[PDB]
Write a protein that binds this DNA or RNA. Sequence first.
RNA 1: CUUGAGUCUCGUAGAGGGGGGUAGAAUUCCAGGUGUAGCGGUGAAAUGCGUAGAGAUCUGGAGGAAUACCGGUGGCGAAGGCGGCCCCCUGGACGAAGACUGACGCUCAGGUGCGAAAGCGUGGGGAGCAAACAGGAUUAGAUACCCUGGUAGUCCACGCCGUAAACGAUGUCGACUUGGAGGUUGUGCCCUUGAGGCGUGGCUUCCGGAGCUAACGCGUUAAGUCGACCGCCUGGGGAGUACGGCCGCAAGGUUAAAACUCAAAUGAAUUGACGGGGGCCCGCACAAGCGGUGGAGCAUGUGGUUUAAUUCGAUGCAACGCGA
Lengths: 117, 276, 18, 150
Amino acid sequence: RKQVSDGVAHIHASFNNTIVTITDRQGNALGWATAGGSGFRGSRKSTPFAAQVAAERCADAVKEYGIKNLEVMVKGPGPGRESTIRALNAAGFRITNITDVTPIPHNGCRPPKKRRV
Amino acid sequence: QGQLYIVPTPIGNLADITQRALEVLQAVDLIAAEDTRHTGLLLQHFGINARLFALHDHNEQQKAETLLAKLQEGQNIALVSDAGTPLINDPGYHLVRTCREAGIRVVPLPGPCAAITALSAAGLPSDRFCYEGFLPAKSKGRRDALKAIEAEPRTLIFYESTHRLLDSLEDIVAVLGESRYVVLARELTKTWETIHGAPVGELLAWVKEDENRRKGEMVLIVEGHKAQEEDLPADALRTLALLQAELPLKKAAALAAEIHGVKKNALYKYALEQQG
Amino acid sequence: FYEKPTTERKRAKASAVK
Amino acid sequence: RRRVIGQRKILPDPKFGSELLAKFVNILMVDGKKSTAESIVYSALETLAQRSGKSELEAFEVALENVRPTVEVKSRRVGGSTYQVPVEVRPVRRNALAMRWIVEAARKRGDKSMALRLANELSDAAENKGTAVKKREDVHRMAEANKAFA
RNA sequence: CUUGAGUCUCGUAGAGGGGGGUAGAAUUCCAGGUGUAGCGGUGAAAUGCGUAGAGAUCUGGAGGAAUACCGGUGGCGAAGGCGGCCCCCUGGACGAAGACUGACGCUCAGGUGCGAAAGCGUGGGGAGCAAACAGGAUUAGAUACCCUGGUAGUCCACGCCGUAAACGAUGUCGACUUGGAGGUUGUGCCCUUGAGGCGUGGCUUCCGGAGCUAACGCGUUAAGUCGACCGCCUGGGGAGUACGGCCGCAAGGUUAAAACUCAAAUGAAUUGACGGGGGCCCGCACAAGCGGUGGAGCAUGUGGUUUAAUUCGAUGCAACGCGA
Ligand SMILES: [Mg+2]
Ligand SMILES: [Mg+2]
Ligand SMILES: [Mg+2]
Ligand SMILES: [Mg+2]
Ligand SMILES: [Mg+2]
Ligand SMILES: [Mg+2]
Ligand SMILES: [Mg+2]
Ligand SMILES: [Mg+2]
Ligand SMILES: [Mg+2]
Ligand SMILES: [Mg+2]
Ligand SMILES: [Mg+2]
Ligand SMILES: [Mg+2]
Ligand SMILES: [Mg+2]
Ligand SMILES: [Mg+2]
Ligand SMILES: [Mg+2]
Ligand SMILES: [Mg+2]
Ligand SMILES: [Mg+2]
Ligand SMILES: [Mg+2]
Ligand SMILES: [Mg+2]
Ligand SMILES: [Mg+2]
Ligand SMILES: [Mg+2]
Ligand SMILES: [Mg+2]
Ligand SMILES: [Mg+2]
Ligand SMILES: [Mg+2]
Ligand SMILES: [Mg+2]
């Protein structure tokens, strides 16, 4: 609506789900989509296909704003890391740079006990 | 092709075995037993030799297929437990179900049962009864289980161990009240056999008088709830208390009465009495 | 434990380097 | 492998540019039988108009629409072992792989010579017959059936 | 008397120790903006969070705990142990060249001190983690892993506890005994030209000779050749248990048997099965296709029914158009 035409895409990748959001330079979100929110459900459907579907849905929702150039941030690992990137690039978007902003701790807090399976 | 036999065993008195059971044990090729060693000793006392198979709940299902295959080969398998009869708080459910669904004859044999033996001499109505087996070992779980069966009008049969008799009795006193009549039957068919019936509080007090009275295995017979309708439903009271915690007293009582369809005056009086 | 994996990784010190 | 190479360039057919006809028999070359097929295609199509009631001009490729596969088996080394992992049919094997297995069962299946086998087995496709079409019914077993592990 | 052992002068490296500051990342929580139905979790789920607006993103603030990269078979410490950066206090070790004292030394039963983690007492602190515990799932029902939470505990100050596979399963000190390849700190000389070459010290890692060892293996940092002193052991179970003494708030710790019972227990190494630990090489074994059986009717043969017999043998991979 505001026709800013410039924004940044935040991607949060997790072993169980992936989240894609679009915001402006001031951090104000405009639209978002998730793999679980795009018809898929369960970890057995957490493949990069669901991630790209969610990215396409987010792009369709945010197309009303007329964004053309996006700076994309990657948060954490996950199958839907590059799939979301290509999905949003294919939806008429001009990529600028890929920034990895995964929150790596400097051994501050003790990690939860690892699984025994 | 061969049939499966559910042969009970004595509950502590060797002399309490049936002749048909001995004949079946000597007439079968494999005997599935809870603890081979135990059964082995029992078989030796009667001079019977046969094959023993370790069948307990831990590996029940795992070996159910093997037992089914053995039965299909025309062999006769007899199932026994350390005591009493199988399938009553003893392994055997999965094997019996597999045999039944596979079209294999099942021949049960009458025999000792601790719950039935206790009930016969319990001195309480036996027309209708509910067997519950062991109670939860945890205090919270035990209290919840006791509360769920508080309103049961039928006689209740429970199994009990010397390790938690005192705690279980205390929980019963707290939940069902000391006015309830309970019968404790200990070491049936043994030298120290003792059946004592009394109010729960009196029973507890008597048991605590001497540790010797809480030694061995036990069965609890609880008289069913009396046919009294004066007391209002407990669920309505619980809902009213929760709504009072979350909402004002008047709205809580109105909502509880509306949902449960009961008189509001009685609920309000009970709430006021509890608050006071 | 959070320390056993570190010891297991350090055990490979003598795998093929020395 | 880091990079992959495409298919080798091959010249077209000067007569009519029928790649399907050329690939039908070229893969099956043996004992110098190319001359037999070359001299048989024209002779067969001359009389096929009355032999089968249709001419091999426009009806030669009207019952092969289902031949074109959508998923093909590729031996890919993943997880430390070989697996199918059916991916979209790339042009390298979309048609060549399916074409190489057409005359594998319609070669000497009731005639003493290949004079009439090659043309008749394909002309019969217009009458709910033939074998090139049913071949696609076997690839579906390993595709769209094990998505949990693929 | 000066060679052992020490003192003085100069310099070197070091997560050595105690105390106080401060820095960055991250987790959690609180609050604001944008934004809107999901988020979280799993093998799949559910409990859990969310329209009184979560998760995502941004912007402030609070708090506790730990110090990514450097980082290394690297370094320091008697051992336990010690990792951001800075300051104050402080211990030890090593190297060059001298001067000094002149056996002042080594080892130590008792004794004294230090001593991982868990635990205890008092008073604080509490982000994350997490015994106990609650709930979900699974089961006919359980237990058990798995999931969501979560209390001690984990942190600080003082005091107690004095136990570890507290291990290098190797007590401390001194001397003698072929050699290579490193790492890490010194220092002397040659053009340090420099990284280099020539030597000379301390610590430390790997291979290996003689010798030793039951073998494994050790091998100048010995488990080799000797010397001084101390501690400890003489079958397995009973049992590091009982009784007593001492120590402790408690948990318990330390010292420490006997009856009875068995003819073994145990160490190293060798041979094969096992195996899924693994890797490798083969065989329409699999891969990619060709044609069949099983679908239907026949003929033969088998298992069973009947019969007076339907003779008997093989009747899992090695039988059923087999003996015949
Ligand atoms: Mg037992
Ligand atoms: Mg039993
Ligand atoms: Mg320091
Ligand atoms: Mg210093
Ligand atoms: Mg301090
Ligand atoms: Mg912060
Ligand atoms: Mg050192
Ligand atoms: Mg002098
Ligand atoms: Mg001493
Ligand atoms: Mg501690
Ligand atoms: Mg305690
Ligand atoms: Mg404390
Ligand atoms: Mg406290
Ligand atoms: Mg539970
Ligand atoms: Mg947990
Ligand atoms: Mg938690
Ligand atoms: Mg010790
Ligand atoms: Mg240690
Ligand atoms: Mg030792
Ligand atoms: Mg060994
Ligand atoms: Mg060596
Ligand atoms: Mg030795
Ligand atoms: Mg002895
Ligand atoms: Mg002791
Ligand atoms: Mg004592």
